[PDB]
A paper describes a structure:
The LASV glycoprotein complex ([name]) mediates viral entry and is the sole target for neutralizing antibodies. We present the development and characterization of prefusion-stabilized, trimeric GPCs of LASV lineages II, V, and VII, revealing structural conservation despite sequence diversity.
Building on our previous success using the I53-50A scaffold to stabilize the Josiah strain [name] ectodomain, we explored whether the same strategy could stabilize additional [name] trimers of diverse LASV lineages. The [name]-I53-50A constructs recapitulate the known [name] structural features and domain organization. Our [name]-I53-50A shows high similarity, as measured by the root-mean-square deviation (RMSD) of a [name] protomer, to those previously described (0.80 Å among 300 pruned atom pairs, 2.4 Å overall fit across 341 sequence-aligned pairs with PDB: 5VK230 and 1.1 Å among 254 pruned atom pairs, 2.9 Å across 341 sequence-aligned pairs with PDB: 7PVD24; Figure S6A). In the ligand-free structures of [name]-I53-50As, the fusion peptide appears to flexibly occupy the space enclosed by the HR1a helix of the same protomer and the HR1d and HR2 loop of its adjacent protomer. In contrast, previously described structures of [name] bound to 18.5C, 37.7H, and 25.6A of the [name]-B competition group, 25.10C of the [name]-A competition group, and full-length [name] bound to matriglycan show that the fusion peptide occupies the same approximate area, yet extends inward and reaches toward the apex of the trimer near the GP1 C-terminal domain. [name]-I53-50A with a furin cleavage site (GPCysR4-I53-50A) was unable to bind the matriglycan array; however, LIV [name]-I53-50A featuring the native S1P cleavage site showed potent binding.
Numbering used by the authors:
A (entry chain A), B (entry chain B), C (entry chain C): 59 to 255
D (entry chain b), E (entry chain a), F (entry chain c): 260 to 424
Write the structure that this text describes.
Amino acid sequence: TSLYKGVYELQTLELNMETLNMTMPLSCTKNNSHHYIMVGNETGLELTLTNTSIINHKFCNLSDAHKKNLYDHALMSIISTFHLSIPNFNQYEAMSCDFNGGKISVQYNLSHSYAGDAANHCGTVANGVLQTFMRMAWGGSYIALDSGCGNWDCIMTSYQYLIIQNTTWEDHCQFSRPSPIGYLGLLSQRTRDIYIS
Amino acid sequence: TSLYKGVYELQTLELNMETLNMTMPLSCTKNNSHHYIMVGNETGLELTLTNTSIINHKFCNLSDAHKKNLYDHALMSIISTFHLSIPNFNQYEAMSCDFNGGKISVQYNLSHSYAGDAANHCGTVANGVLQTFMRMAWGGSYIALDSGCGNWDCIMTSYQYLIIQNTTWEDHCQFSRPSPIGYLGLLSQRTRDIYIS
Amino acid sequence: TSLYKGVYELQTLELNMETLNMTMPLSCTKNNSHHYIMVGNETGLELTLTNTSIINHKFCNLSDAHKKNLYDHALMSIISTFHLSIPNFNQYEAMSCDFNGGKISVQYNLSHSYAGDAANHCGTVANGVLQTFMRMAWGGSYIALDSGCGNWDCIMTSYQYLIIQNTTWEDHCQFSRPSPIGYLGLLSQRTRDIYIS
Amino acid sequence: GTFTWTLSDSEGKDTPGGYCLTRWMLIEAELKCFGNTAVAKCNEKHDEEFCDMLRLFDFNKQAIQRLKAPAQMSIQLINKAVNALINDQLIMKNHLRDIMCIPYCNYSKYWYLNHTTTGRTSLPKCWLVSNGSYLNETHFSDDIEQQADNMITEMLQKEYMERQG
Amino acid sequence: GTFTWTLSDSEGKDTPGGYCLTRWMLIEAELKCFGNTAVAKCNEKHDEEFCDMLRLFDFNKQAIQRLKAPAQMSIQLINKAVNALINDQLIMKNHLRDIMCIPYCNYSKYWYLNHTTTGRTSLPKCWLVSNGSYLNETHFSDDIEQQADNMITEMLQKEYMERQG
Amino acid sequence: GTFTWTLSDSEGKDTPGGYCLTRWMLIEAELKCFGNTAVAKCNEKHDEEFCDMLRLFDFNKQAIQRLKAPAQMSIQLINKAVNALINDQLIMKNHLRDIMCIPYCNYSKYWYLNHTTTGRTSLPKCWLVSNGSYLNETHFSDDIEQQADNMITEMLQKEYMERQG
Ligand SMILES: *[C@@H]1O[C@H](CO)[C@@H](O[C@@H]2O[C@H](CO)[C@@H](O[C@@H]3O[C@H](CO[C@H]4O[C@H](CO)[C@@H](O)[C@H](O)[C@@H]4O)[C@@H](O)[C@H](O[C@H]4O[C@H](CO)[C@@H](O)[C@H](O)[C@@H]4O)[C@@H]3O)[C@H](O)[C@H]2NC(C)=O)[C@H](O)[C@H]1NC(C)=O
Ligand SMILES: *[C@@H]1O[C@H](CO)[C@@H](O[C@@H]2O[C@H](CO)[C@@H](O[C@@H]3O[C@H](CO[C@H]4O[C@H](CO)[C@@H](O)[C@H](O)[C@@H]4O)[C@@H](O)[C@H](O[C@H]4O[C@H](CO)[C@@H](O)[C@H](O)[C@@H]4O)[C@@H]3O)[C@H](O)[C@H]2NC(C)=O)[C@H](O)[C@H]1NC(C)=O
Ligand SMILES: *[C@@H]1O[C@H](CO)[C@@H](O[C@@H]2O[C@H](CO)[C@@H](O[C@@H]3O[C@H](CO[C@H]4O[C@H](CO)[C@@H](O)[C@H](O)[C@@H]4O)[C@@H](O)[C@H](O[C@H]4O[C@H](CO)[C@@H](O)[C@H](O)[C@@H]4O)[C@@H]3O)[C@H](O)[C@H]2NC(C)=O)[C@H](O)[C@H]1NC(C)=O
Ligand SMILES: *[C@@H]1O[C@H](CO)[C@@H](O[C@@H]2O[C@H](CO)[C@@H](O[C@@H]3O[C@H](CO)[C@@H](O)[C@H](O)[C@@H]3O)[C@H](O)[C@H]2NC(C)=O)[C@H](O)[C@H]1NC(C)=O
Ligand SMILES: *[C@@H]1O[C@H](CO)[C@@H](O[C@@H]2O[C@H](CO)[C@@H](O[C@@H]3O[C@H](CO)[C@@H](O)[C@H](O)[C@@H]3O)[C@H](O)[C@H]2NC(C)=O)[C@H](O)[C@H]1NC(C)=O
Ligand SMILES: *[C@@H]1O[C@H](CO[C@@H]2O[C@@H](C)[C@@H](O)[C@@H](O)[C@@H]2O)[C@@H](O[C@@H]2O[C@H](CO)[C@@H](O)[C@H](O)[C@H]2NC(C)=O)[C@H](O)[C@H]1NC(C)=O
Ligand SMILES: *[C@@H]1O[C@H](CO[C@@H]2O[C@@H](C)[C@@H](O)[C@@H](O)[C@@H]2O)[C@@H](O[C@@H]2O[C@H](CO)[C@@H](O)[C@H](O)[C@H]2NC(C)=O)[C@H](O)[C@H]1NC(C)=O
Ligand SMILES: *[C@@H]1O[C@H](CO[C@@H]2O[C@@H](C)[C@@H](O)[C@@H](O)[C@@H]2O)[C@@H](O[C@@H]2O[C@H](CO)[C@@H](O)[C@H](O)[C@H]2NC(C)=O)[C@H](O)[C@H]1NC(C)=O
Ligand SMILES: *[C@@H]1O[C@H](CO)[C@@H](O[C@@H]2O[C@H](CO)[C@@H](O)[C@H](O)[C@H]2NC(C)=O)[C@H](O)[C@H]1NC(C)=O
Ligand SMILES: *[C@@H]1O[C@H](CO)[C@@H](O[C@@H]2O[C@H](CO)[C@@H](O)[C@H](O)[C@H]2NC(C)=O)[C@H](O)[C@H]1NC(C)=O
Ligand SMILES: *[C@@H]1O[C@H](CO)[C@@H](O[C@@H]2O[C@H](CO)[C@@H](O)[C@H](O)[C@H]2NC(C)=O)[C@H](O)[C@H]1NC(C)=O
Ligand SMILES: *[C@@H]1O[C@H](CO)[C@@H](O[C@@H]2O[C@H](CO)[C@@H](O)[C@H](O)[C@H]2NC(C)=O)[C@H](O)[C@H]1NC(C)=O
Ligand SMILES: *[C@@H]1O[C@H](CO)[C@@H](O[C@@H]2O[C@H](CO)[C@@H](O)[C@H](O)[C@H]2NC(C)=O)[C@H](O)[C@H]1NC(C)=O
Ligand SMILES: *[C@@H]1O[C@H](CO)[C@@H](O[C@@H]2O[C@H](CO)[C@@H](O)[C@H](O)[C@H]2NC(C)=O)[C@H](O)[C@H]1NC(C)=O
Ligand SMILES: *[C@@H]1O[C@H](CO)[C@@H](O[C@@H]2O[C@H](CO)[C@@H](O)[C@H](O)[C@H]2NC(C)=O)[C@H](O)[C@H]1NC(C)=O
Ligand SMILES: *[C@@H]1O[C@H](CO)[C@@H](O[C@@H]2O[C@H](CO)[C@@H](O)[C@H](O)[C@H]2NC(C)=O)[C@H](O)[C@H]1NC(C)=O
Ligand SMILES: *[C@@H]1O[C@H](CO)[C@@H](O[C@@H]2O[C@H](CO)[C@@H](O)[C@H](O)[C@H]2NC(C)=O)[C@H](O)[C@H]1NC(C)=O
């Protein structure tokens, strides 16, 4: 390559973040419709954008799940980090869960990209949930939006639901290099966008 | 002016924060009894200290307002930032609201500067609400207190209510230069003074 | 002592943190079973690890205490800081209180070091409460654990209850130098380990 | 971009030796240009106060020119800008000084030294206030003299090294 | 330990002049060793980006070798490591640049200058991306040239002072 | 005020070359004065540990002398002082080192080097502990030698420039 000032060779370095799996979660993409968060070499979450309507009730039995604690605390912690990072999340009926003991089973209803709230306007529930999604899958999530860069409040997708389910570790990642940055960026939220009750 | 070391002229610079209106709110004063927070060049909040008793019920219908979302999210966000920054706010019956759809209508009852809580002692509800007020209107709010600098817990005013209402943009500001610092200082709260339930 | 490079004498300095009592709380130890947090030169909290079962009901009357405000706000603030810093505190029935007006009276039930939650496994309620305890009494708390350094999630003690009660100032501290660091470290929590409802 | 404090990657495509503050961001100033030597100093965090406003002005401009203006504030966006750009300890310290009756930064008026024959200037420092008004010039004598010595020292050291290496 | 950026107190019990990145943490690199002169720079906070990964790699290793691996992630532990080791303003700035359509750090590819006869290298800088791909080399010409001048300056100043004192 | 680390604006109205620690804040020390050259170093953030205590002592004093003592702690005030004055990464790192079985800062005992004929001293560094006790002197040999070289270097560079410019 190019020689700078007649004495320096430009050289590059690429870091392998795949060896950080034992201490921190790694986020990656696969094909837009699917993104993954892996922990260790055993399990993780599958984040999908799909027209599937898998949960058909309007409530999340969290307190019940906490009493029947049959779940991996690491996965619940990651999900909580995701949930609590959704700015201005007012539409609680849009979040439904079916833990059934140890499953994750979490569904966010963004139907028609406003989920019944008024109309598909900018700055709505879909925007709130999608911004967190885009950050959690920052390694690669840009493929999800065609126009969102020019106006951050008009992030909209066509998919009706954001589905979070637990899966096993598989070599799921492609189209990118697994990275903890999305997750780390969410942990250091600092400012929370919370409306008064 | 003065020449330093025989070679430097002291010079001054004054920044115009009035051109930051499109991206961040600007706080200013007017006549103690009134302070303002303006957004863009269209609207904002009028913060007043007055013996008016405008809301005559003891509740704030926030969940109802969130379902009937006829409000500017920017104003609700600013108000929330204010509310959640009141340290040790235990007296919930002191906060009353009447959104009536799209209005702000927020009243904080500091009557007799303790609002019925014991007596007008230092470190009470009036102090909590006023400290946040003093910071939100930091550009200029010092005119509100005659003795508070010598003992931060004895900030007291004579006015019974802190009223927050939405208004239109008008060139309201005088006695100071509009500045985002109060607001920015509140966003970076870092530590929250919250008692256990 | 040793002379470095032939010209410097190594010298030491020891700071007296006991003179910081008027503006910040100081934490110290005494005999493992007891630790203290002192404020000013008048009062403070006694933190104990004991098989005493002092509170025999499963609830904490906080809202009632807030209405009947007969308590030192400083002590309530310190306790709140402690409580809100317990990661993943799901077992609410484990926290019982009897303020009776102005007392602190706070009991955390870690019985059998899982408090009835499954079995005495790593990463449980005892671990959550003890990690906060260990930090609040960081000046000296290491005497509490024989093996915890090798695995932070397996911090366990044999004592059934963590008891927090208010006492008077006495020269309680021994085995260490009073220090605000534990408390300060808890105030700057930054990241909160909170599960979804 | 010679300024790590800015968001733009095109910041350096301007007068190589100076950064200019437009007339629009100043009060009756018309034009103020500071040497890049001084402006670049806040690439490092020095708890400088002045560059917190420059970071907000830089943000403000980028948020207007690169994005379609949303025309709805996007408070949720400024919130991230604040956490990324603002020195919180400085705001809190000025707050503490205010409430502790200690002179503090107003975030409006700044002062700098301007060399009378070279046109070289210092980075600006915040003019302090106390009890509703500005502190008198005499109370800044020590600060001004030190700033003047710092500039003299830099000029001499620069000249020394140009001659030496 | 010559590195205040590390957690280990045994960090300096290695080649006195260099810090090595194991083959295991690199992608097809086999071995990369950077001089301690450059690596030690991030003992100070310079919003460098590269050393945030080094701090995570250092943490990761210490968390594995000194503790019994819990084999259960201990997310509650990484959370403290993050707050202690990570520069949050940099992550937020790269986020803002991304959403504001400004080239930003990928946290994968880095570049550095390597002197062709001495083997001395610069601390690495993050290679920027924009719209799904990497920026072309021409857009880094200014950054590379400045880094090259910084290294030249350091070599000359070092030589100057070795001769002078 | 030559110290940007302090809250007081009258900090410099004292011995121009030194900052003194009163007998009241020390354990059986009677009097300790450190040169301003070294004390002023923590005007910049170096993750120094020692000056976090100095900032608390400075705060503590200002909070007592300028305000009517409220005599009720004002925990809500210390909370702001903490966020403005304390280096959180250092506390968290010492916490992590403790729980990771790595020697860490006790925030009590500090050491410094004292030149035997000039009386000039270094800024103090925190003495480390591990498993209930203090680390032995031999384990600090590398740190002490480096600090000694840093002081020697500074003395020589100062002398060099006094002669040169
Ligand atoms: C920083 O920015 C860059 C720019 O996008 C991102 O770049 C991606 O990097 C990842 C790896 O970290 C790339 O993933 C791999 O790309 C290979 C590209 O090979 C091409 O050419 C071969 C020729 O035979 C084709 O076969 C192939 O299809 C491509 O056309 C793929 O070959 C790799 O696939 C292999 O590995 C994956 C797992 O990693 C397996 O699932 C596959 O079966 C196969 O074994 C792989 O896809 C990605 O392509 C890069 N994209 C681009 C456009 O550069 C970085 O990810 C980003 N870093 C971060 C995290 O910010
Ligand atoms: C930093 O600290 C300083 C010190 O208080 C604060 O100073 C204030 O700065 C604001 C402007 O930013 C000043 O506001 C303006 O003051 C003018 C003063 O003029 C005087 O003399 C004329 C002579 O004819 C009189 O007419 C006038 O009444 C005054 O006696 C006013 O003239 C200005 O009024 C005009 O503009 C306002 C809108 O800005 C209009 O509403 C009016 O109708 C009129 O057109 C204006 O009031 C303020 O006076 C300053 N106070 C002092 C004591 O200095 C800074 O605000 C502060 N900065 C921050 C934000 O920290
Ligand atoms: C940093 O790390 C060090 C290492 O542990 C901690 O060290 C402790 O420091 C505290 C003081 O800050 C020590 O407390 C005092 O220790 C004295 C030790 O004296 C010994 O020798 C005499 C000989 O007659 C014996 O009588 C005595 O029992 C000891 O064997 C005690 O004498 C002191 O007791 C006196 O003061 C206390 C109150 O301080 C009174 O309650 C007593 O009645 C008596 O008057 C006192 O105990 C402690 O011993 C040190 N431990 C060790 C092993 O060094 C620092 O605390 C730590 N700093 C922090 C906060 O991180
Ligand atoms: C609200 O904020 C805007 C900044 O976003 C404030 O400033 C005004 O902004 C417009 C658009 O950039 C400027 O327009 C320009 O005018 C010059 C005139 O010579 C022209 O050459 C340019 O092509 C362009 O049209 C306008 O000058 C500027 N005005 C200023 C700084 O005075 C606006 O003033 C703020 N409004 C309120 C109520 O605070
Ligand atoms: C999950 O994380 C681990 C790191 O904790 C990843 O790397 C593998 O870690 C093991 C244990 O340290 C390495 O074992 C060593 O192999 C060498 C081979 O020459 C041997 O000499 C040593 O004595 C030791 O046995 C292993 O090499 C290393 N593999 C790498 C970096 O490729 C692991 O790959 C991660 N797994 C997943 C699914 O991501
Ligand atoms: C997922 O759905 C969206 C939105 O379509 C709605 O929901 C569907 C499940 C179905 O009930 C439709 O009748 C609803 O209208 C699909 O996106 C397209 O959106 C544009 C407007 O933005 C609309 O004009 C198109 O007709 C929609 N496409 C179709 C086939 O109707 C999206 O393509 C669906 N994705 C998948 C994988 O099915
Ligand atoms: C606002 O009210 C305060 C407090 O007065 C009380 O509330 C009034 C509405 C009325 O019901 C009074 O009878 C109540 O006592 C006024 O402040 C003064 O406070 C001092 C003690 O600090 C008291 O001795 C004075 O009598 C009060 N002033 C008056 C006229 O009673 C304050 O002035 C009122 N402000 C306005 C604009 O009306
Ligand atoms: C506090 O209790 C623990 C745990 O013992 C249980 O609770 C007691 C109050 C009593 O009801 C016991 O029968 C319960 O088993 C004591 O710790 C020991 O724990 C080990 C296992 O880790 C067990 O084998 C021992 O038998 C327990 N010790 C005794 C005497 O039973 C702890 O010692 C008690 N501490 C004090 C001060 O009483
Ligand atoms: C979530 O909790 C509700 C109760 O709060 C569960 O609904 C009850 O289910 C039982 C049968 O198991 C019925 O007899 C009750 O009449 C139901 N009550 C209500 C209000 O519907 C619900 O099944 C739980 N769901 C999940 C996914 O755990
Ligand atoms: C989500 O996690 C749970 C718990 O790890 C998985 O449930 C286990 O599945 C195996 C195989 O079917 C059973 O033998 C276990 O008894 C189940 N345990 C529990 C607590 O239910 C579940 O399969 C995972 N989800 C997915 C999609 O793999
Ligand atoms: C997800 O949310 C949408 C929007 O609220 C639900 O769609 C509504 O369904 C009812 C009953 O079929 C219709 O009367 C409404 O008109 C639909 N709303 C809109 C905007 O078309 C949808 O049922 C929810 N899905 C799940 C699985 O809960
Ligand atoms: C806040 O909500 C309460 C209900 O929770 C509203 O009060 C009810 O108003 C209807 C008439 O619209 C009456 O028939 C009910 O009897 C009232 N219930 C109670 C408990 O008072 C109240 O009006 C709402 N207020 C605002 C400002 O929105
Ligand atoms: C607070 O904001 C609301 C909404 O922007 C304002 O209400 C509007 O007022 C105009 C003029 O009276 C009506 O034509 C609109 O239909 C109203 N909209 C709604 C949603 O009610 C309200 O006037 C503002 N408050 C003040 C004091 O100006
Ligand atoms: C604001 O709060 C005050 C204080 O609680 C209320 O004043 C009380 O009113 C009742 C009924 O008139 C009296 O019996 C009490 O003695 C008053 N309290 C005191 C301390 O004098 C006031 O009504 C509230 N105002 C509004 C609009 O809610
Ligand atoms: C905590 O609050 C409960 C009520 O929510 C108190 O229990 C009541 O006590 C009265 C007598 O004072 C009885 O008549 C009621 O029947 C009790 N109700 C219930 C639900 O038990 C309880 O005593 C309070 N405890 C403390 C420590 O304050
Ligand atoms: C905890 O604090 C309360 C309030 O400061 C103490 O209660 C006081 O005790 C004295 C002596 O018995 C009584 O004269 C007071 O009337 C009590 N005040 C209240 C509000 O109850 C209590 O003693 C302290 N706890 C301990 C263990 O000392
Ligand atoms: C503290 O918690 C323990 C654990 O939940 C309680 O112990 C239980 O007591 C009941 C009734 O005696 C027994 O049937 C259970 O078997 C006990 N649990 C276990 C694990 O042995 C204890 O009573 C609670 N103490 C207080 C003061 O609330």
